[PDB]
Design a protein around this ligand. Structure first.
Ligand code: CA
Ligand code: CA
Ligand code: CA
Lengths: 71, 110, 155
């Protein structure tokens, strides 16, 4: 590692000590639950986008056919 | 070969199961969503974990939020370029292309 | 579109064909050949608001005058009456359900599975003529544009 890579590595670990390191077991259980619900919600929006992508490729292909044939 | 009233009778039914296979495909995607989310966002097992392992879990969950959010941005951007070029194609293909009640109430009435 | 009107006439119960005949016979009062010229049609138009020109009135007649008489008889009158009484987004989503191999076209066999999954008992003539009505370039398949014109007027 150099120094920009050292900087990014440290500022990411600092992001965790600021959000986590001052909590007790009960205060930290509620935090993990809180963080997991964010992951669930983000994975759901990723799933919805993956399906939309599969469908666009079909619409793109059909439009590719129509231009290909109408000339 | 067959009457014009039949060929419309068949088309009305064609669109009726093409609509029932559209929304059957919907719930098949809803169940496919929960099954996928169960493997990706596994529910938490917090009982029995010590403070050391509670804190370790809270930290890797913190790093996973940032990771999944850019895994989602990368696919969000792909569907954004698709929308733009969908509009391009849909456009470049367009650039290549009395009253019953009134009439019956006037002559009769009831 | 067209043959959807011709189908609507064949579905008129004798309760409506008695309604329309009674109205048609009041239309042709004063006409010598028993049909609707511009004189009879203009009277009824004034009777409900407007006053079209003797050529705007002849355009309405020629839109349904299949025997070249310049007038409207009772059979042509029923076509007039049904013309006077889904979107591309809906039809595009349903189009994808027909195209099971997802190649962008609706070929013969994909039509038959859809037809055989409708509940009716499907005749080979039904298969034969639905593809003749749908496929207008004659290349053995219904494409998107042909599919839209093939479902025009279907609820
Ligand atoms: Ca005529
Ligand atoms: Ca196909
Ligand atoms: Ca074709």
């Amino acid at each position: 590692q150099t120094e920009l890579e050292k900087k990014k590595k440290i500022l990411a670990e600092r992001r965790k000590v600021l959000a986590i390191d001052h909590l007790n077991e009960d205060q930290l259980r509620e935090k993990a639950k809180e963080l997991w619900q964010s992951i669930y919600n983000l994975e759901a929006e990723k799933f919805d986008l993956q399906e939309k992508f599969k469908q666009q490729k079909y619409e793109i292909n059909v439009l590719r056919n129509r231009i290909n044939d109408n000339q | 070969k067959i009457s014009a009233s039949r060929k419309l009778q068949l088309k009305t039914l064609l669109l009726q199961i093409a609509k029932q296979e559209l929304e059957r495909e919907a719930e098949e995607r809803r169940g496919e969503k929960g099954r996928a989310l169960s493997t990706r966002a596994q529910p938490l097992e917090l009982a029995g974990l010590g403070f050391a392992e509670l804190q370790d879990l809270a930290r890797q969950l913190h790093a996973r939020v940032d990771k999944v959010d850019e895994e989602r941005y990368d696919i969000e951007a792909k569907v954004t370029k698709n929308i733009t070029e969908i509009a391009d194609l849909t456009q470049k293909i367009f650039d290549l292309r009395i009253s019953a009640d009134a009439m019956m109430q006037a002559l009769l009435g009831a | 579109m067209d043959d959807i009107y011709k189908a609507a006439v064949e579905q008129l119960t004798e309760e409506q064909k008695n309604e329309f005949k009674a109205a048609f016979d009041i239309f042709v009062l004063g006409a010598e050949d028993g049909s609707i010229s511009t004189k009879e049609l203009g009277k009824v138009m004034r009777m409900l608001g407007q006053n079209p020109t003797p050529e705007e009135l002849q355009e309405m007649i020629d839109e349904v005058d299949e025997d070249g008489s310049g007038t409207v008889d009772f059979d042509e009158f029923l076509v007039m009456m049904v013309r006077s009484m889904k979107s591309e987004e809906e039809l595009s989503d349903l189009f994808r359900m027909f195209d099971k191999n997802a190649d962008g076209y609706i070929d013969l066999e994909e039509l038959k599975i859809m037809l055989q999954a409708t509940g009716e008992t499907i005749t080979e003539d039904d298969i034969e003529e639905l593809m003749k009505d749908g496929d207008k370039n004659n290349d053995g398949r219904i494409d998107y544009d042909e599919f839209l014109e093939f479902m025009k007027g279907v609820e």
